[PDB]
Amino acid sequence: CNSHINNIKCSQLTANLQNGFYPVASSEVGLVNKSVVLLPSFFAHTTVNITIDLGMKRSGYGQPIASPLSNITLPMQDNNTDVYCIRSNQFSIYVHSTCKSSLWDNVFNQDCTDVLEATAVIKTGTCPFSFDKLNNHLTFNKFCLSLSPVGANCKFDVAARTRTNEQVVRSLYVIYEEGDNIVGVPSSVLHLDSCTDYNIYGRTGVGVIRQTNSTLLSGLYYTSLSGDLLGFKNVSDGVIYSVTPCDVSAQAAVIDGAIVGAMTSINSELLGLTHWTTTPNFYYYSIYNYTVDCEPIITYSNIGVCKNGALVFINVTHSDGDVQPISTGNVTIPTNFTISVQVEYIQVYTTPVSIDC
């Protein structure tokens, strides 16, 4: 994959494309700015620090082993430190670890080195979210951590990652309910007339944000039947923004293993095609020198495409007309004849199938 024709080949899993029309993206994006719109409310941020102290040791063979006897520390709240809860509007969660080692059991007065060395990693166990994603703009009604497996929803697996293997030492339980009160944050800015990765009022996607003048939105945001965000309102101004995709489907016309032209709704160069014309429903880009009269090779709809990229439209069959039952004045009666043979197929029967249940 490295060229527009080869990207079509990759998509279709073929090394040899046939003459015809293939679906392509009008463009591709990546490495774009992030845009967020949060519910105004009030700033109130809590930094949450989890410290994992790993007690690594060694075996006769030397297979490094972590000790279930390891210590997870959550910040201090209500004196007990076995359950920490978030009681603020915004939060950030960070995990840090210290690796200690021993030759003698349960002394841990020596730094771990080399093959004993480990770093703690918190990974998804049974929760519908990763630990490291809690710093994205995830929203909760409630979020509280617990080292006690009592009346708790899902759990995270806390593992020691070494230079040899990885194993789970402890579980961290998390209590949560979905809602919009508590929002995760990395450590309300949007970028207009640009392709952006957005998170708007709890709706995530990629698209282009534009400022418009309308009164259509009754609530914070309006969506399509598919659930996609089509637009939203700024709570303070009442100004409406529209949201559209950064790219749309386009049809690439491929003849003899090359892209000859393509149809798209966006008036932007695609697939290396720089010349174009306009059709009733779309824009047509091609190799043809556009600012025709030819025979099309491939067709679809009422459109044909010629080898040189020229775009042709199909006419309706003409005839002289029917002979009318008129016997007054100068009339025409067919005189010279030839024979034509027309061929048609009609299905008469199906092929019966017997199935042994």
Partner: protein
């Protein structure tokens, strides 16, 4: 639009003009119809759907809601900063329109506020008298507490407020943070305390409720009961009710 005030309480219908804030009066105070029904022409300003869900619900739904008004008491005036209401021994003497003699399930407080004012209006405390007699108090603070009571603002607040249930003046539970705007407070017989339609606190059934206002705090207090109705809701705010 021209605003006129009509009063037939003494048996003779009298017509006079209105100044003050007539538009607000027509947007908040209604005459109760026989059976306790709310007039079809009432805009439902500050009447929120009561829900247990944390999310925002909108559309046409049929639910059991306290939309039957046993007595509507408009623009209440209290002898002192504090007042007491009861779900049982309550007495209806200032009902606007028809009065229905039944037990009250919910007492709904339509709060008086103006957009973008942050005026010195609110309650110092709400005191809930449960069955056994345990008095639980709700009060909200400017910062996190770690006996002084606090302040529950009406309308727009200048910042965050942390709400606690008090007992012996000692915080008993953290409830949460108030919304940017407090428009309605509704308290049920069954122990549920709602803010703007959201269940904020739940406890044992309540015999009586009282509060102490800071320094016309309410548009109206409605003594209501539960009925089945079809309601049109926009952002948890009721726009139309068909019983």
């Amino acid at each position: 639009v021209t605003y006129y005030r009509v009063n037939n309480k003494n048996g003779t219908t009298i017509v006079s003009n209105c100044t003050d804030q007539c538009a607000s009066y027509v947007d908040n105070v209604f005459t109760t119809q026989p059976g306790g029904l709310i007039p079809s022409d009432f805009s439902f300003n500050n009447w929120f759907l009561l829900t247990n869900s944390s999310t925002v619900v909108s559309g046409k739904l049929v639910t059991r809601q306290p939309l039957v008004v046993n007595c509507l008491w408009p623009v209440p005036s209290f002898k002192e900063a504090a007042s007491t209401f009861c779900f049982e021994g309550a007495g209806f003497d200032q009902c606007n329109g028809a009065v229905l003699n039944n037990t009250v399930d919910v007492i709904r407080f339509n709060l008086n506020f103006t957009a973008d004012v942050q005026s010195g209006m609110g309650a110092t405390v709400f005191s809930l008298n449960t069955t056994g007699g345990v008095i639980l108090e709700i009060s909200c603070y400017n910062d996190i507490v770690s006996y002084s009571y606090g302040d529950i603002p009406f309308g727009i607040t200048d910042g965050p407020r942390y709400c606690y249930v008090l007992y012996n003046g000692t915080t008993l539970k953290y409830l949460g943070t108030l919304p940017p705007s407090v428009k309605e407070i509704a308290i049920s017989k069954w122990g549920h305390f709602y803010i703007n339609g959201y269940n904020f606190f739940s406890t044992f059934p309540i015999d009586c409720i009282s509060f102490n206002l800071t320094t016309g705090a309410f548009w109206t207090i409605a003594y209501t009961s539960y009925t089945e109705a079809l309601v049109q809701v926009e952002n948890t705010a009721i726009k139309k009710v068909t019983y």
